[PDB]
Amino acid sequence: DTKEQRILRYVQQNAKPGDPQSVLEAIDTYCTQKEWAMNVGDAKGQIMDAVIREYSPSLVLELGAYCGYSAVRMARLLQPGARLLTMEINPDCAAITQQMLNFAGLQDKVTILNGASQDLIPQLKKKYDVDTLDMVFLDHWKDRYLPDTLLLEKCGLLRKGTVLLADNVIVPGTPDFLAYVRGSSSFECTHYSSYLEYMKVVDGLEKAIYQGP
């Protein structure tokens, strides 16, 4: 009986059907109460929104999904003609995510693929008629952030101005990923550190904008 399952359940019992905002609130609440995650709206959500709004991407790729919070958060802001593609290796998390999008009524803005990013990324151009990406959201599996970044490049999926946003990038974590995008001339970087009301970083996010090879 997983945490992400109990989150889904809580949403299904308490959120307003087809109301993404309600859904996000229900998640944020339960996790804060449970202390699985504190004020995800202010710590992570708000930052996601600002990035979406600054860039107004037509095509967003989410790599990694836990309970579907991030997918709802992004999908709810996408305008007609804009879409989210989501990848997650863990099948339960994938499914919870789908079910979470369903409840919000956002399922038609999103395409979920349950598989390894290493195997799925190279199929995007061929299998999925993707030429390049406007935005990528890296989530969940921090160890996959750098490999993913490198593979996207390799597959020719990034273009000048493609925005990467990675969640849960807090020192000393994801050491290899941060060093790379910061040191690389192909990435223009901005780090976001959410402290909420205290002194300890609650969430760290990295925005890295591809500057071409």
Added chain:
Amino acid sequence: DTKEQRILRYVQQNAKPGDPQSVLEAIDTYCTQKEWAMNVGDAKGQIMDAVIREYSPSLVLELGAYCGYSAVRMARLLQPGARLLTMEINPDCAAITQQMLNFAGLQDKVTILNGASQDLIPQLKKKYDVDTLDMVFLDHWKDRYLPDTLLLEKCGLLRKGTVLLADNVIVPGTPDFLAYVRGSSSFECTHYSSYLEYMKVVDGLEKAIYQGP
């Protein structure tokens, strides 16, 4: 011949009059060439914009102004009925700032006050008929950031949701300012680190949202 005199000159010679974006582009382009300040539009301007857009303040107070870049950046986004108040202790910077807003055609959006923040702040409610502030932009003189913040609270000028944004808050600088706002429950805090394309932080900003006494 001061740097901010020389920035003003460059703008006047090169930017399109009455064009804020042109003026912002003239200052960046010049400071960058002089290697006085790299890519201020990416490093600082874009963040300011994101904050203004998120919060849509009616009244912004800027404390500190060097050449006026920030005042132009913020004033160009304020809608009818919104206004900027700028305080700067150095009389030439204040005047450059005014002449810079003139060139951009933004002078009616702004009131510039020449004087010490400690002296001007307490006169705001009384002399300038302010109740509280929607946003405060701290700029230019980092040593004043903490005492400004405290005086603004003392003067009853912050309300729940008042957004403070401080420029040039790069560790190990302003350690007390940062420890104060993060340490205090009266502030909900987010740090922005702009790396541009490099390994090292170019500019750092702190958003602190007042949460009450």
